[PDB]
Structures are given as structure tokens and as C-alpha cells.
Amino acid sequence: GKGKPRGLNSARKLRVHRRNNRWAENNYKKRLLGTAFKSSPFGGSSHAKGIVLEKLGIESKQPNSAIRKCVRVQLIKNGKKVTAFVPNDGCLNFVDENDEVLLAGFGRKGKAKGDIPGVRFKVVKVSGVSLLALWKEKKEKPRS
Amino acid sequence: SVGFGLVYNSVAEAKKFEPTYRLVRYGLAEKVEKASRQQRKQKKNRDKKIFGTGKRLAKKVARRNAD
Amino acid sequence: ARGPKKHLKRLAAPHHWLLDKLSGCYAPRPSAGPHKLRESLPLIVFLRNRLKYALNGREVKAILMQRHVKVDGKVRTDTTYPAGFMDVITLDATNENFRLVYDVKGRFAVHRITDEEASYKLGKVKKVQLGKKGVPYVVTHDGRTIRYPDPNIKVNDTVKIDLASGKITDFIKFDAGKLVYVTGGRNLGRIGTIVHKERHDGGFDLVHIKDSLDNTFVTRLNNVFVIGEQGKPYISLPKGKGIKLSIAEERDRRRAQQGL
Amino acid sequence: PRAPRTYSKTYSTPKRPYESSRLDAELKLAGEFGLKNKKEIYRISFQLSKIRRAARDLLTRDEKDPKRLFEGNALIRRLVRVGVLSEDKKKLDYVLALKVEDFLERRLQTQVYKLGLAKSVHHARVLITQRHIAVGKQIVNIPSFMVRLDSEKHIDFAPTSPFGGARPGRVARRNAARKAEASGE
Amino acid sequence: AKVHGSLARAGKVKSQTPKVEKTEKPKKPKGRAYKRLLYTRRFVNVTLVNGKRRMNPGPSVQ
RNA sequence: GGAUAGUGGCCUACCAUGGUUUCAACGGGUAACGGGGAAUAAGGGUUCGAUUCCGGAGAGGGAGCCUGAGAAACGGCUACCACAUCCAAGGAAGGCAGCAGGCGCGCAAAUUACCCAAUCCUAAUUCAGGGAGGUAGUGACAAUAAAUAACGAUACAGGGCCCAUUCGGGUCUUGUAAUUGGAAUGAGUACAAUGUAAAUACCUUAACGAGGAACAAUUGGAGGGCAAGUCUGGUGCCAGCAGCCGCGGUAAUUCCAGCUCCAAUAGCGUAUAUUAAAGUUGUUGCAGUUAAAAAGCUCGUAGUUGAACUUUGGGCCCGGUUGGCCG
RNA sequence: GGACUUUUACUUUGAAAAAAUUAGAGUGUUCAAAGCAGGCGUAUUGCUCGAAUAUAUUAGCAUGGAAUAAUAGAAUAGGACG
């Protein structure tokens, strides 16, 4: 019964057949195709710093309704064009075109967060300085 | 306060066997006024560019600039 | 690695020296000599780690440079000279005669023998060869070669050497019963008779052993060092006679000897 | 190329961050033994676990096991020498029922209090960490000391510090000195 | 979908919440002192109740 | 046979056609140096290992070689290749994956500091030399210890057991303070001595160093999961929040703030990876009529697997161990 | 009395076996992480215990076992034993 070999000598089959099924698992397969190195905008890196190209007013999905304040960024190490979300009340005024900004993920491990569509990254620093310091008026955006 | 101590059998027999850094604490030895390592080294390399006495070399150099 | 190595990282050294972990990156590293560097004992480790007669490694040399120390009678001056098993070491300027001989753990115990006895040692023969010009010779475990030996002397048999003339003065054969010292392995430091030698063609003869307590342990022929007759040592054994006790029996002997 | 001067950590945060039940009990403890934070309980909660594990494993073995007896009685003899295990509860079965406050009680902190000297653990806190203590000749300014049996009859004030003789403190000495240069001359 | 919406009111509300400065107060005790404060308060004297006891009730029911 | 220090298709002549493979050869990929080990704690496992030790390899890329016991060596040479320095324009010279230090790369990593006192190495050698190594500087990588207050006085409320007919009340001990009281201590500052090769910090110690605008603790959160507000003000499907469910369309417990409260605390949050949770990779240990999934069917090789029986039973010896009991 | 499985797998116990790491014994770094120290005394020319133990699940080697599971042997007798 049970539909799998039980023999004392069936170790190869058991070993290989699990090797064969480990592919139906995302994280595994994601780890062996080296997708983070290849497809992902960061190189699998946790952060990446790019240059701001334009501001976006992205409308959120249903059943929400607002304008979701983001920027298009060209990652330095790639040249990759990625769009990231500037968080908190009016922080989009802290960032400007050709600024350079630190981007990070959204803790969704690839996926987009909340209701903002196609935006899988968030702005953490602009022009060397953190936002939750600019926002809190602890420091000021260096006059460039 | 716990420390360590030594009692040699005669002064100069301590003179001998004592690390010279201790003796200078005791006014038992004089401080060698020496060139810093880098300065010592930079000389070892400067002299190294010379083969022989140098006193020949100085004649070599000086004859040139007196015509 | 392009040639012979000259350093010893302090961690790759033999544990049975008991050097500390910290306090430096390197260990002494035995020079080339009588004993295999892993099976040896530098004079620096004896004279400051095992006797505390020195502190600095500098003061080790200053003692040696004073010729203050003989090994096997010859005055040795190399800081990291590789002394070993059955060696003597004689600090004359203080009337001390030792003999590097094993602990009951696997270490080199500070064994003090008399001002006599230091006039000889023992030697396990390693090979017995016909040299050139027909001369025969034996080779002992400390790189001693003695030409013209007793024809009876075969390999593994020990040999009573003097210490200012070479020369064998009686010896012991390897048969059942003899009193044996284990010189390495899991039983290093132990002493016992024989019972059996289990020979194996191809390689590796094991030698079953029994001590003075009816505990039977086994090692490899390589590690066995005959030193005389049953209950009759040809030298002075260290304290405990290399009998070995359990951690249990250890602990009892401690707390009992402890107090009063 | 040196030797990796080894180390390890002492505590162990709880698997579930917000248990109103657990969080209550932890706070009760922090107040009666007069602790500083939750880490000082995590430290002891963790210590306790290995002990119970060490004993959890030894008990599975056949009795009169050469290793069980040595490593057990050695465990028991230590636990008793500090005042956490009862003098005649010397069995591994009784160490698995051991709980946090047993350990927590034996701190210098709750000894300076538990025999005069303090009349408050929070008083006892500041007394220890201000040199006003001496397990014999030795000052001990760590609240988490751990007082051993035959050491219990030695916990007293310092040969230094006003509460032990030789000079009063430097605030007293500034008061009896300001009534001097003034009301005197 | 639509990516070009209005950036006009970037922070409409933070910029119109009437700044009211923080009313000062005595500093609360740090370290052990604070936990002592919490042991005594929360369960030695026992104040406000309901058959459940309550941490932060605003102006009760009455 | 030659060659090598030597074995050997290592090379060469001649001779045969052999050698590996579904028990995976051969080829491909690796963001691959191997191991000692590391992270994760029911067990089994999963993931990781450039990096304190061992082995290997390399010194911008390749090849060649001199010297020597040992090097196919690079702080040796020779050449080609890729760089690239000085120049009186004829020429000459350099290989930091040594230690510092710079440019570049980037999310990402410190001083062009002192010394051979220690640890050990080397030479003709106690003595010289050693950016090995040690020492300090930068250093919230990790890890340990754990200050930011302690105790009283008094005025009310009373935990007040009572006495007890009533503003009648014993009497400690909780809690409240725009009320006061003296005690304590190091964080620092600093004579000295200690420490050190010298200086530095630790340890020790004169003189100092505690009353609130200080010696003033932070970080996140308060709908649910999940511990803690249906309080106040602002906004009005806007701004924003929200890992997930969701909040916001004028009484918002969820945004922006004030106040209060909760949680960890000299540390707390975020992102990325990974482990546990996951019996959602299942050997242990999953699922497959209808939720994902039995090849249309039979045959059949490799694979896995494969009925029963052969000295069973009887009877002794010897010397062991926990418990009866008892001192 | 030494050698001795037809040919094996399996299982027992040992041997050769780096240190560090891990587990874990002792030790009052003032506690602890550590470290491998140290402890006693006439402390004016001394004494003394230490620096354990366990782990390696592959393979090789040595060894006690013969249940389970494989394997060889006499059929035209080209059989065994002396």
C-alpha cells in the first residue's frame, strides 16, 4: 500500500523522486533558477539606489480611492526602470527629479502591497537623508 | 594588589638577566634615544640603493658638478 | 607549498603540551631532531610551561645559552629542541635529573629521577639491519643507531643504553608477559603486561594488554613500548604507575584526599 | 590567525509576544524580586530550560548508568550549593519540578533584603550597586550575584562605605562642613 | 491603470492640522523604578474595574 | 625504448580494439575552493560554510625558466597579451588577492598611527630583522555585565480585625502629593600610584561631581490577528494608513495631531535571505470518486519486491547482578 | 592448540584516530560572556590537586554474534571422505 516503494534498497527512487518534486515548490525553484539574480530589479540585493525620473499619481484599486504618490526610478547598477512608492503625508515634496533615492521592498517578497498596483518598492532615503527624518524635520534635504 | 617580584643574587647579575625595559624604570639603564622605525627603515632602503662605500660615489657625484 | 614549513599556528600544536588558547598566534614548533615533532617536547615548554623556571621565551634562551641544560648528557642549546620519551634532561646547576615519561592522561609528566639512573635510558628498537662492510646495526626510537648488536635483539625489543658511550647493556625481548608502556593512542600513559599479540599479515598487529587491576585494553603494536618484567620496571614509573581510573573513581580520590 | 575567543548569549525571548496571562505573571515577578526589565527573567527562564533538559535526558537512561550517576549528582550537587534545590530533594525528578523563583530568590538582591540590611528590594538594588556590600572581604556590586549556602552567613556591609565604618559619605561630609565655615566662624 | 493623477495636494492634511505644542510634565522614572511603578499600580492597590479591570479608560461611562 | 627523483600511454615506435554508460556515462549550469564547522532546538530534517584551524590554488592574463634541498617562485627573471610610470624624446622603469592609504564599484566594510615588551619565525645568530605578531585609533558586526534613583516626615483617603450608640475609632502598613527632610552613589572631572616597551583605557584612590528648564531613554504601537482609548481636536473615498482582513464618502477607536495608555528597552523599527510554524515535499509523515492530481488499454526491459521447510528440544556445570531481610 | 564465514549484508564491542566548536566535570573571572586557572601555609627563601569525560551513525581496519535476507555445493555423478 501507500503508493511509494518501501524496500530497504529503494533509497535512490525515494531520493530522486523528492528531488523531482521539489520543483512544484516556488521558493525552492526560485532559489535554483537564480531568479533573484536574473529577473528581479535589485540583484537579489536588499536595497538599491536609483535616480528619480518622474513623479506619478497612481490611482489605487477597489474599493479604495485616492492618488498614491510614487516615482519612476532608474537603478544605477542596472539602468533598470522601476517605480517606487513615497510614503507618509506629503513626503513626495521631499523628493525631486534627478535626486538619487534608496529603494527597498514592501515585505511582500516580490508581490505588490495593499492597493497600489505595479509598485513593489518604497523610498527610504532621498539625497543621502532618510525620509522619517525629513518628514519629522530632524534633518533637511541638502541644498543641491 | 597582587604582583610579581624577583630577587637576584647580586646587582650586576640582575643587570645581565633583566629585560632592559625594567632597568630603565629603576634608573639602572639609560634610554636609547633612537630614530623612529619608519625613519630607521627609510634609511635602510636609502642605503640599499648604494653599492660599495659611497665615498667613492660622492667623488663620482661631486666631480660631475665641479667640471 | 614550495618547501618545508617553518611555523606552527597555536591550535595546530599537540594538545598534550597544554599551551593556552589566547596569548599569541603561534606555538613553538619542534625543530628537527630525535623525536617526531608531534610526539616530542620542546625545551622551551619544559623550562617555562612545565617547570616555570622561565617566563619570557627570551629567558628560556638565556638559560639554554648558559649551557645550563643537558639532554641525554649532551648540552643542547636550541630553544625549540625536540626532546621526547625516555629522554633525561639534566639541569646541573640545581642538581635536578628528570626523565620525560608519560602521564596517565597522555601528557609528559615532570618525573624526577636520581643523580644515578640518569646515566642511562631505554630504547625501543625500530629496525635491525645489516649495514655496509657487513656490520650489523639497530635503530632506536630516538634516532640512535648502535653498530654491532646482540644477534638476539630483534625488532620491538627494548634496549638498555648507557648515556656517555652508547652501547647496549642487556635488553628485553617481546614475548607474552613482559611489562609494557603505551606510547600513543587512546591508551597513552597506561602500563600493563601482555597476554596476546594478534598478528595480521598485510599490516597492523594489535597487542592486547592487561594492567595491575585486571582491566584488558588493546592498542597497535606501534604504540607498545616494553620496559621490563611483570611488576618489575627497569625505570621509575611516575605516580599512579599509569594505572588509569574512571572519572568516577577520580572524583572520589579527589574529595577524599581533599580536606585534612 | 588568533584563537576565536568564544562566547554565547544568556537569554531567550518568548515564542508569543503578547500573552496577557504570561505578561501579568512576568510583571508580578519583576516587582517582588525588584528586577529591571523582562530580560532579567528571560535570562533565568533560559537557564532553567537547559537544566531541565540536561535532567530530562539523563532520566531516559537506564539507572546506574555510569554517565547518568556522575552527570546527575554533579548537577544536583551544584544546584544545592547555591540554595535553589532543597537539602533533601536531591533527585532529578525533583529538579524537573524546579521553577523560576527558586533561582530568582537566591540573588544577592533578594538576600540583602531577606535578612535585614535593606527593608526593600529596591533599596537592596541601590545598596548593592553602590559598593555597600561584602560577601566577606570582597565588595560585590552585581544584584544578580547568586549567594551560596555556606556563603549566606557572610553577607554584610563593607569595610568601606559609611554603613560599614571608616568615614561617612561625601554628602554628609559636605553638610557637617557647611555648618562649620558659616555658623562657626 | 491611470498613472497620471493629481499631485496638487501633496500632503493636504499634515499641512492643515493646527500645530499645538506639547504640554510639559514631570519625567517618568526609567529602569527598575518604572517597572516598580507598574507592579504596584496594576495589581497591588487595584483601581478602576468592571469585572475585568481596565488599563486606559477615557472619562468612563460616568 | 626515451624521459623523470621515481611508478605510469608521462612521451615515442610497433601491435591489437579496446575503455565509460539508465546502478545516469558524456555534456551543460553553479551568483561552487573542500573540510573542521554555522543557523534552526520533540524526533527526523532544512539551510549555510569568502572568512581565526587543516588541505588546495593563485599573485593583471598566459607560457617559459634561472637559482636552489625545495619554486614552474612573481615584493625572481624572459617573452607574448592587457595595462601603464619617468624622460633632456636618445632611453629607463612598475605589477598592493602583504600592511596602511587612494580611485572605481556599489546596500555594503576602519589609521597612509606605535613597538618588537609578549607570541613565535629567520640568519653566520642570546644581540640583528620581522606591517608575522602585538599595541593603540576608527568601530551599536555579534556577545557579557546592567545607572537613569533610594529612604523617611506630614496632611488627607483608608488595605483599616476590632472597640462600637453616632462627626464616636485601635493601630501598623498600602496609595495620593505645585508640602517639606536629611542620607547614597558613579557618569564624569582629576593629585597620584597602578597599568604600558612608551603612552591610553580598565582596576585603586586625594580634591571635587544630585533636585528637577537635570546627570531630563529611546523605539514602535493602541480596530482584529495582538498587549493597550469609542477620550479631544483636524481632515472628509481628499490627504493618508494599511504585511493580511481592512480604515477614510462631517458623530474616523485605523489618516493628521494633543493627551492618556500598551510592548520591548540602551536599544527598537524596516528591507532582503533563511529556519521554525509546514504532516504546504510527507523515510518518519501528506494528498489523488466529487477540492490540485490514476497513463485509454495491455504487454514488457531496467528498477523495486518476492510462499514454506533444514539443531528443535531436553538435561548439567561454573561463576555474576536489583528488592527479600538485618545491623 | 593456532589458523578457520562457500561468498556477503546486518548487528556487538574495540582500535587508529587534531585543536578550536558542541555536549559536559572542576575552578568563586567580585557576577556573567569568558578564561584554564588555581588552592593552602611559619606567606624569610615553601607545599599541592588540575588542565577530565562523551560525541564521529559513511567508508576502511580489528572483534563477539548467527536470527533475518541473500549465495555456492552431489543428477548422464566429470561427487565426498582415506
Instruction: Output the DSSP codes for C67-86.
Output: T--EETTEE---TT-EE-TT
Q: In this structure, are residues A89 and A62 in contact, taking their beta carbons and an 8 Å threshold? A: no
Cell of C211: 594492567
Measured CA to CA, the distance from residue C195 to residue C178 in angstroms comes to 9
Helix (H) or strand (E) holding A43: none
d(CA C222, C1' F319) / Å: 36
- The closest alpha carbon to C85, from C108, C59, C116, belongs to C108
Q: Report resolution (Å) to 1 decimal.
A: 3.1
- The closest alpha carbon to D144, from D33, D46, D48, belongs to D33
Measured CA to CA, the distance from residue C80 to residue D21 in angstroms comes to 66
Cell of C17: 603540551
Question: How far, rounded to the nearest angstrom, does the alpha carbon of residue B16 sit from its chain's CA centroid?
Answer: 19
Query: Are residue C86 and residue C9 in the same domain, yes or no?
Result: yes
Closest-approach nucleotide to residue C18, Cα vs C1': G51
Is residue C62 one of the residues assigned to a domain? yes
The DSSP output letter for A4 is: S
CA D125-D127-D132 angle, 5° bins:
150
CA B46-B47-B51 angle, 5° bins:
130
Query: Are residue C103 and residue C157 in the same domain, yes or no?
Result: no
Query: Are residue C23 and residue C128 in the same domain, yes or no?
Result: no
Residues of C in contact with B19 (CB under 8 A): 56, 58
The bridge status of strand C145-147 relative to strand C158-161 is unpaired
Interface test with C, best of B6, B8, B16, B17 (most C CBs within 10 A): B17
Residue of E nearest to A57 (CA): E5
Q: Which of helix, strand or coil describes residue B41?
A: helix
User: How many angstroms separate the Cα of D23 from the Cα of each of D19, E31, E39, E42?
Assistant: 6, 18, 11, 12
Is residue C260 one of the residues assigned to a domain? no
Q: What is the 3-state secondary structure (H, E, C) of chain E?
A: CCCECCCCCCCCCHHHCCCCCCCCCCCCCCCHHHHHHHHHHHHHHCCCCCCCCCCCCCCCCC
Helix (H) or strand (E) holding C247: helix C247-257
Q: In this structure, are residues C197 and C177 in contact, taking their beta carbons and an 8 Å threshold? A: no
Q: In this structure, are residues D146 and D106 in contact, taking their beta carbons and an 8 Å threshold? A: yes
Query: Are residue C86 and residue C103 in the same domain, yes or no?
Result: yes
Q: What is the 3-state secondary structure (H, E, C) of chain D?
A: CCCCCCCCCCCCCCCCCCCHHHHHHHHHHHHHCCCCCCHHHHHHHHHHHHHHHHHHHHCCCCCCCHHHHHHHHHHHHHHHHCCCCCCCCCCHHHHCCCCHHHHHHCCCHHHHCCCCCCCCHHHHHHHHCCCCCEECCECCCCCCCCCCHHHHHHEECCCCCHHHCCCCCCCHHHHHHHCCCCCCC
The DSSP output letter for A57 is: B
- The closest alpha carbon to D60, from D34, D29, D96, belongs to D96
Closest-approach nucleotide to residue C246, Cα vs C1': G53
Is the preceding peptide bond at A63 cis, omega within 30 degrees of 0? yes
User: How many angstroms separate the Cα of D118 from the Cα of each of C96, D132, D147?
Assistant: 59, 11, 16
Measured CA to CA, the distance from residue E41 to residue C13 in angstroms comes to 62
Is residue C51 one of the residues assigned to a domain? yes
Q: Which of helix, strand or coil describes residue C169?
A: strand
Cell of C260: 585534612
For C94, counting Cβ atoms within 10 Å of its Cβ (0-12 exposed, 13-18 middle, 19+ buried), the class is exposed
Question: How far, rounded to the nearest angstrom, does the alpha carbon of residue B62 sit from its chain's CA centroid?
Answer: 31
- Expressed as residue numbers, the domain containing C187 is 174-244
Instruction: Give residues 3-62 of chain E lying near strand F (Cβ < 7 A).
Output: 5-6, 9-14, 16-27, 29-36, 38, 40-42, 44-45, 54-60
Measured CA to CA, the distance from residue C29 to residue C14 in angstroms comes to 10
> Which experiment gave this structure?
X-ray
Cell of A75: 537603478
Final residue before a domain boundary, out of C69, C88, C116: C116
Q: Which of helix, strand or coil describes residue B37?
A: helix
Q: Chain D: give the shortest CA distance to residue E7, in Å.
A: 41
Measured CA to CA, the distance from residue C218 to residue C208 in angstroms comes to 4
**Which amino acid makes up residue A14?**
L
Measured CA to CA, the distance from residue C75 to residue C54 in angstroms comes to 18
Is residue C255 one of the residues assigned to a domain? no
Is residue C249 one of the residues assigned to a domain? no
User: How many angstroms separate the Cα of A36 from the Cα of each of A29, A33, A42, A43, A120?
Assistant: 11, 8, 8, 6, 14
Phi-psi region of C52 (alpha: psi -120 to 50; beta: other; left: phi over 0): left
Q: Give the residue ranges of DSSP H helices in A7-88.
A: 11-21, 26-32, 35-38
Query: Are residue C125 and residue C103 in the same domain, yes or no?
Result: no
Number of domains in chain A: 1
Residues of B in contact with C62 (CB under 8 A): 17
Residue of E nearest to A86 (CA): E10
Measured CA to CA, the distance from residue E7 to residue A68 in angstroms comes to 9
Measured CA to CA, the distance from residue D183 to residue E45 in angstroms comes to 47
d(CA C161, C1' F136) / Å: 56
- The closest alpha carbon to A87, from A100, A106, A72, belongs to A106
CA C2-C3-C8 angle, 5° bins:
115
Q: Residue window 116-175, chain D: list those with CB within 8 Å of chain E.
A: 122, 125
- The closest alpha carbon to D29, from D17, D19, D20, D40, belongs to D40
Number of domains in chain C: 3
Is residue C61 one of the residues assigned to a domain? yes
Q: Long-range contacts for C85-88 (Cβ within 8 Å, ≥24 apart)?
A: C85/C35, C85/C39, C85/C141, C85/C142, C85/C183, C85/C225, C86/C121, C86/C122, C86/C123, C86/C141, C86/C142, C87/C34, C87/C121, C87/C142, C88/C113, C88/C118, C88/C121, C88/C163
For C155, counting Cβ atoms within 10 Å of its Cβ (0-12 exposed, 13-18 middle, 19+ buried), the class is middle
Q: In this structure, are residues C85 and C141 in contact, taking their beta carbons and an 8 Å threshold? A: yes
- CB count within 10 Å of CB E2 equals 9
Query: Are residue C91 and residue C193 in the same domain, yes or no?
Result: no
DSSP characters over C197-213: EE--TTS--EEEEE-TT
- CB count within 10 Å of CB D139 equals 17
Size (chain A), residues: 144
- Expressed as residue numbers, the domain containing A10 is 1-144
Q: In this structure, are residues C72 and C88 in contact, taking their beta carbons and an 8 Å threshold? A: yes
Measured CA to CA, the distance from residue A10 to residue D174 in angstroms comes to 88
Q: Chain C: give the shortest CA distance to residue D27, in Å.
A: 42
- The closest alpha carbon to D82, from D154, D9, D145, belongs to D145
**Which amino acid makes up residue B1?**
S
Q: In this structure, are residues A136 and A97 in contact, taking their beta carbons and an 8 Å threshold? A: no
Q: Find residue A111's DSSP bridge partners.
A: none
Residue of D nearest to E40 (CA): D31
Instruction: Give residues 62-91 of chain D lying near strand G (Cβ < 7 A).
Output: 67, 70-71, 74-75, 77-78
Cell of A128: 543621502
- CB count within 10 Å of CB D22 equals 12
Measured CA to CA, the distance from residue A23 to residue D18 in angstroms comes to 37
The DSSP output letter for A113 is: P
Measured CA to CA, the distance from residue D123 to residue D109 in angstroms comes to 9
Query: Are residue C17 and residue C63 in the same domain, yes or no?
Result: yes
Measured CA to CA, the distance from residue D113 to residue D33 in angstroms comes to 10
With a CB cutoff of 8 Å and minimum separation 6, the contacts of C14 are C38, C39
Is residue C253 one of the residues assigned to a domain? no
